[PDB]
Design a protein around this ligand. Sequence first.
Ligand SMILES: Nc1ncnc2c1ncn2[C@@H]1O[C@H](COP(=O)(O)OP(=O)(O)O)[C@@H](O)[C@H]1OP(=O)(O)O
Length: 287
Amino acid sequence: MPRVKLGTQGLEVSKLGFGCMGLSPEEQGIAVIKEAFNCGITFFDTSDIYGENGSNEELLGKALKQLPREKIQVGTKFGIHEIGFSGVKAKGTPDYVRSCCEASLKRLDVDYIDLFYIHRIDTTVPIEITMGELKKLVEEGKIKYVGLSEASPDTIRRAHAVHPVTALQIEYSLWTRDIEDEIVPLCRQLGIGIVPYSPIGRGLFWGKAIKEYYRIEALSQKHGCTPVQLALAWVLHQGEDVVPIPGTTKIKNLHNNVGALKVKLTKEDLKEISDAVPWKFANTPPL
Ligand SMILES: Nc1ncnc2c1ncn2[C@@H]1O[C@H](COP(=O)(O)OP(=O)(O)O)[C@@H](O)[C@H]1OP(=O)(O)O
């Protein structure tokens, strides 16, 4: 398991991270996390909003009790205040920041969070305000690093000016590449790590709909791996500063995901993959 510097403040994580969301039966859930660590994954992602009344955080904290905490990077988040019909409501008031952090510390049962993200941007509150409180939490040692999720470029530069952003969590995969145009260049110029969520889930949903593509399957075969491994490998190859956090509830798929690390792709391999996703009658359909 290769290790990489995420952002430029000293955070180090396993090149592949693990998304805890899906896990929210307890013993089974814990076992998956344990096995993830056995495979060398040390970077674990959750959020106060996952599961019911922060049960996903509570689950992770339980899991950490049979793991060496200081070998693990705990990523969690605050920001989503209530989900109703009208949509997602975000809150970024310093008080909320602080209250959310404390509640996460309690649920995870930890003295500190390695990477604490703003899950959703509060568009009624200047980013500098929310970042200011996080900056304080870094100084008190309650959190070590600061993350942003799905943030505007304006919001990214402004945040970073108050206190260095360690990571940006955003959707990125073969099926969603819109960060490439300006979000990626921007992160690299600021030295911010990139953390793709849904690096494979969107493709899986798509693949299943079509099977109810051949190009991609043909390429996975060419490279001696499964289609989901190809998709994941493609993400992994987008930079040393790129650390995806796929999740699973199945030990088998976890091992499959880890196996994606062995898939090695040349620049030409990669372009080929991107380009693909923008009885003398016994003839078959061409690719
Ligand atoms: N190796 C694999 N093969 C097929 N499906 C997988 C997989 N690894 C994860 N998934 C699925 O892909 C989904 C997660 O991908 P993400 O890319 O981690 O998801 P999301 O879109 O929710 O952010 C889950 O539905 C997960 O289902 P399982 O719990 O049944 O595994």
